[PDB]
Design an enzyme around this catalytic site. Structure first.
Site, PDB file in Angstrom:
ATOM      1  N   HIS A  33      33.726 -14.116  36.333  1.00  8.71           N
ATOM      2  CA  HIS A  33      32.546 -14.183  37.175  1.00  8.71           C
ATOM      3  C   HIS A  33      32.610 -15.538  37.877  1.00  8.71           C
ATOM      4  CE1 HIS A  33      30.659 -10.838  34.865  1.00  8.71           C
ATOM      5  NE2 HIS A  33      31.430 -11.340  33.920  1.00  8.71           N
ATOM      6  N   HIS A  35      33.061  -5.006  41.413  1.00 12.84           N
ATOM      7  CA  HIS A  35      32.176  -6.043  40.897  1.00 12.84           C
ATOM      8  C   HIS A  35      32.960  -7.278  40.451  1.00 12.84           C
ATOM      9  CE1 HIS A  35      29.531  -2.493  40.588  1.00 12.84           C
ATOM     10  NE2 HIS A  35      30.399  -1.952  39.752  1.00 12.84           N
ATOM     11  N   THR A  58      26.984  -6.839  32.498  1.00  7.41           N
ATOM     12  CA  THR A  58      26.858  -5.901  33.597  1.00  7.41           C
ATOM     13  C   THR A  58      26.364  -4.580  33.047  1.00  7.41           C
ATOM     14  OG1 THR A  58      29.195  -5.230  33.413  1.00  7.41           O
ATOM     15  CG2 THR A  58      28.673  -6.926  35.007  1.00  7.41           C
TER      16      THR A  58
HETATM   17  C1  LIG Z   1      31.174  -0.283  28.941  1.00  9.97           C
HETATM   18  C2  LIG Z   1      32.029  -0.551  30.163  1.00  9.97           C
HETATM   19  C3  LIG Z   1      31.783  -1.925  30.716  1.00  9.97           C
HETATM   20  O1  LIG Z   1      32.461  -2.879  29.878  1.00  9.97           O
HETATM   21  C4  LIG Z   1      32.131  -4.207  29.980  1.00  9.97           C
HETATM   22  C5  LIG Z   1      31.141  -4.685  30.817  1.00  9.97           C
HETATM   23  C6  LIG Z   1      30.823  -6.040  30.812  1.00  9.97           C
HETATM   24  C7  LIG Z   1      31.548  -6.903  30.002  1.00  9.97           C
HETATM   25  S1  LIG Z   1      31.120  -8.623  29.922  1.00  9.97           S
HETATM   26  N1  LIG Z   1      30.839  -9.131  31.438  1.00  9.97           N
HETATM   27  O2  LIG Z   1      29.910  -8.705  29.168  1.00  9.97           O
HETATM   28  O3  LIG Z   1      32.278  -9.285  29.384  1.00  9.97           O
HETATM   29  C8  LIG Z   1      32.573  -6.434  29.199  1.00  9.97           C
HETATM   30  C9  LIG Z   1      32.848  -5.074  29.177  1.00  9.97           C
HETATM   31 ZN   LIG Z   2      32.051 -10.508  32.109  1.00  5.71          ZN
END
Ligand SMILES: CCCOc1ccc(S(N)(=O)=O)cc1
Ligand SMILES: [Zn+2]
Ligand SMILES: OC[C@H]1O[C@@H](O)[C@H](O)[C@@H](O)[C@@H]1O
EC number: 4.2.1.1
Length: 257
Positions: A93, A61, A196
């Site tokens: 992203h 991803h 995510t």
């Molecule tokens: C709980 C495992 C996934 O961890 C994350 C998923 C998304 C983010 S974000 N894109 O909000 O920074 C950070 C950790």
């Molecule tokens: Zn992020």
């Protein structure tokens, strides 16, 4: 599996992850005129001098640069935060085109990309326990625009050819995340979520107002990564951003007058 395409993208995530329609989802549009200066915010402290990066991973991803978080090295304190938050990973992203790619927007403006430096609250011991808490995480978000190159990003760009496909990783020691920061630490902050799956509502968001500039060549190399695994049909890793979600019963606070 969840992803960013028509059949598995953000508009489908709620089926497996009902919190996708929750009360504190991220990202959001930052309406700069409605955000209010908050004099109760303490000075923000980004202390990355002793960071120990370990590895870079294509997880299908995005790509994550992972850090040794086994003791207090790279930490975030101050601002809206109670206590100490330890850096665990960063990722980005980004878009298929320079006109999109950020998750947060600023008065509806989409930047070319957005950097997320992910930290967990040390009072909870481990990242896994932190993501069971409403104040478990702090994510420092930094916008990217296309212009002059960011020298401190080039080491990341140059390793991407070795992690092209999902599941590939490479050693990535001695990377200094201080080279990814803009000059100013002016920020907006609000309570939100992971962007995510599993979309957990554990995050204090701290979004810097000043973007960093990266070159077109740098972001073009992000767009050569693949969502797919080795040997599978190529699907370029682009447009791996969730759009802005409803603000609901939240206020965005500004660190600056
Ligand atoms: C709980 C495992 C996934 O961890 C994350 C998923 C998304 C983010 S974000 N894109 O909000 O920074 C950070 C950790
Ligand atoms: Zn992020
Ligand atoms: O009731 C007044 C208060 O309303 C809140 O929603 C605002 O966040 C405060 O800054 C304000 O002082």
């Amino acid at each position: 599996h969840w992803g960013y395409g028509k059949h598995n993208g953000p508009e489908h995530w709620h089926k497996d992850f009902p919190i996708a329609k929750g009360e504190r989802q991220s990202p959001v549009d930052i309406d700069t005129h409605t955000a209010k200066y908050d004099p109760s915010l303490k000075p923000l402290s980004v202390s990355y001098d002793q960071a120990t990066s370990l590895r870079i991973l294509n997880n299908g991803h995005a790509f994550n640069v992972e850090f040794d978080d086994s003791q207090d090295k790279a930490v975030l304190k101050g601002g809206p935060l109670d206590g100490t938050y330890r850096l665990i990973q960063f990722h980005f992203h980004w878009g298929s085109l320079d006109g999109q790619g950020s998750e947060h927007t600023v008065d509806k403006k989409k930047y070319a990309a957005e950097l997320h430096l992910v930290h967990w609250n040390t009072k909870y011991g481990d990242f896994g326990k932190a993501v069971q808490q409403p104040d478990g995480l702090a994510v420092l978000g930094i916008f990217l625009k296309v212009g002059s190159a960011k020298p401190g990003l080039q080491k990341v760009v140059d390793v991407l050819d070795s992690i092209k496909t999902k599941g590939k990783s490479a050693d990535f020691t001695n990377f200094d995340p201080r080279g990814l920061l803009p000059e100013s630490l002016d920020y907006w902050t609000y309570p939100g979520s992971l962007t995510t799956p599993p979309l957990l509502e554990c995050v204090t968001w701290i979004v810097l107002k000043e973007p960093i500039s990266v070159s077109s060549e740098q972001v073009l190399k992000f767009r050569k990564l693949n969502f797919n695994g080795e040997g599978e049909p190529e699907e370029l890793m682009v447009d791996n951003w969730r759009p802005a979600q409803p603000l609901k019963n939240r206020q965005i606070k500004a660190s600056f007058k």
